[PDB]
């Protein structure tokens, strides 16, 4: 209903977590959009947005979000509130951990979206990330490769935070 979650996935991990986010919110509040099938105009239809993306190939956007990314100057995000979550691997890719959500947040915030859902960095071991902005991660950082035991917990906490900063 009122929250549009647009995700991309290469091997399926970011899709399974978008299903949990959806269940945690309610089940009719958020509708999911796999961005291999979305047009950039679909983002226009929501005032509260959640963007989901893994980082692939040392700091790049997942292939479907990369296709869409080059069209994001064509939508105005003023007046919208946006949260971000990504899946990635902090030991394997210690210098590029979660880069994809910092790249997508830079863009959408330049186009006037206001970022909500900032997440602390404690509990992670990484060298560098593009998602680090204003002292925190720009959104929920999950790691299914090395901290899958922590995912359900982190989603429950972040969704409770977002119902506050989204105003549900
Ligand atoms: C060859 C390869 C490159 C990867 N690159 C990055 C990277 O630069 N940063 C990061 O945080 N994780 C990186 N990852 C980890 C993936 O983001 C991670 O396994 C993720 O859950 C995949 O999600 P998906 O199944 O939704 O595509 C890499 C994975 C592979 C196997």
Curated annotation (Swiss-Prot):
Domain of life: Bacteria
UniProt similarity note: Belongs to the flavodoxin family.
Organism of origin: Nostoc sp. (strain PCC 7120 / SAG 25.82 / UTEX 2576)
Record-level Gene Ontology MF annotations: electron transfer activity; FMN binding
Annotated ranges, domain Flavodoxin-like: 3-163
InterPro entries documented for this protein: Flavodoxin (IPR050619), Flavodoxin/NO_synth (IPR008254), Flavodoxin_CS (IPR001226), Flavodoxin_lc (IPR010086), Flavoprotein-like_sf (IPR029039)
Task performed by this protein: Low-potential electron donor to a number of redox enzymes.
Keyword Electron transport: yes
Protein name, entry field: Flavodoxin
UniProtKB keywords: Electron transport, Flavoprotein, FMN, Transport
Gene: isiB
Cofactor(s) of this protein: FMN
Key word Ribonucleoprotein present: no
